[PDB]
Design a protein around this nucleic acid. Sequence first.
RNA 1: GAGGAAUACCGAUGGCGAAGGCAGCCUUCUGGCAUAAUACUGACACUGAGGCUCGAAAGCGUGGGUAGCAAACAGGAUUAGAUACCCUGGUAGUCCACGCCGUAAACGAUGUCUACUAGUCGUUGGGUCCGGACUUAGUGACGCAGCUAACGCAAUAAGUAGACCGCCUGGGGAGUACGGCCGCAAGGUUAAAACUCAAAUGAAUUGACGGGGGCCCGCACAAGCGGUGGAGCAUGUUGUUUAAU
Lengths: 153, 57, 115
Amino acid sequence: PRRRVVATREILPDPKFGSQTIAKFINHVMSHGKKSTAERIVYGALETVAQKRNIEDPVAFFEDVLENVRPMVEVKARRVGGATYQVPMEVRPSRRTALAMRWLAEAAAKRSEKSMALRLAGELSDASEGKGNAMKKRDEVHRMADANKAFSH
Amino acid sequence: PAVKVKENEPVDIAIRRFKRACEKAGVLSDVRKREFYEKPTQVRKRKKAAAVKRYKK
Amino acid sequence: SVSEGIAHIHASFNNTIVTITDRQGNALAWATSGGQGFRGSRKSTPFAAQVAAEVAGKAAQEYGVKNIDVLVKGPGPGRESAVRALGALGYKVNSISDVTPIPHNGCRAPKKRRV
RNA sequence: GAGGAAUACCGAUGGCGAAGGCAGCCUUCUGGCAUAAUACUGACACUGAGGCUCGAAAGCGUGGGUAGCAAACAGGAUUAGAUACCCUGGUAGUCCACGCCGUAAACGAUGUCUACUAGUCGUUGGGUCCGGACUUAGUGACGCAGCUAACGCAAUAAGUAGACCGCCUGGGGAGUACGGCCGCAAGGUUAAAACUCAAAUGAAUUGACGGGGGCCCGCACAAGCGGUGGAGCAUGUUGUUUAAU
């Protein structure tokens, strides 16, 4: 806000994996306050890639793809006497995960797979190697960050 | 304003020493006064305004 | 060919020109902020001078220069960033100097801008 | 290599000059001022209508010069337009010699010359004493009494008095017309009237406002989630239509 720094809320970990990273990603897929509907989408997507790639533990796999999507430099908007300098700055770690979790869900929602659980499974697989809109979005932010690379104010 | 870098001295330290020598010589102060022509009437006001400011403190 | 050289860091408020020559005054290579993809507001930045000196310094590094003394001139912002580029490129500086033309109340300056 | 102009630093509510003004350095011609003492003249003084002299910048005449800057002018932009601000050029002028012009917010918006009236702190040029002290002639910052509508001035008075000169008499019309005088010209100077309106003004007060400043707050922005604006329907209004809607 304008004065204080309100404390962030506590999020309970997901019931099937006990990780706060997946439970936070379920929050990013949920709409209309339907937790369970989003859970089977995430669980179905994770099961599909786990059953296809032959991995016993997919929480570490989701970390690998998440770290491959998280940007490191973002382009902020700054003003110096009426001039707009698109200064590129670092991304605070809480915002890194939020941006990556956001891009994956929004990129998977425009896929062409049959089911959303299948749509999300494709993006998780595609982003694992380093392709897809989620990877493309991260490059676009980094492309703009490298585009200036000249305002260090 | 000439700084001769000595042996075993990182340019980062040397450039800091050069920046100090240039500031002492008033290098950038003179080039800023030559950017535009200051009318003699405006010079007298500016000098006197600084003179009044200097005396007050 | 030549080992001793001179780096000229002529820098203005709009652009910075970094030409590096021999001890005599015969140019070997030159680079500019505006000739590196930067235009307008990004051309008058210290970083655009950092890459201009990097390109020009590396261009004549093949000539054989290792000893070089910079001669900075002008009020531009790339007067400090450009010299750092040469130091980090493997150049062994001889002397940092600031030869800027200061008139002794000579020709009349242009009129003050009303902005 | 050519050429012109200005003289960074020193540089200073520092200095000199009646004002206008006057900054590299050197020579020549030359004015005033400041200072201690002695000698001398012995009121020779102050002011001053007309008059005369000098008088920034711009401008004018003739003749030279012409680097930079730059009216005009040309182009590029910005904009609804942009005969501007900004950008790229650029001529007169700015420079020199000799003459005109005689005007500036030529201001301290404060005529000149006297004497007297608490004090404090700087600073420039002297002087006399013992690093200080004092005394002068300037130049400043404060601050009593006193003055002032108030602001403020306050030994450099806007205080206390005196000498002489100049000027004002509501705001516009108007520093304009006409007539003189001056000027090459631009114009300057002297200087009304009819008519018109009940105001026009100064200082300060309280607000309000500022594309003034400083500090702060609100889902105000920012960071996000979901909408409205497109479809169909419900409802309200406008409009239109109606006998009335």
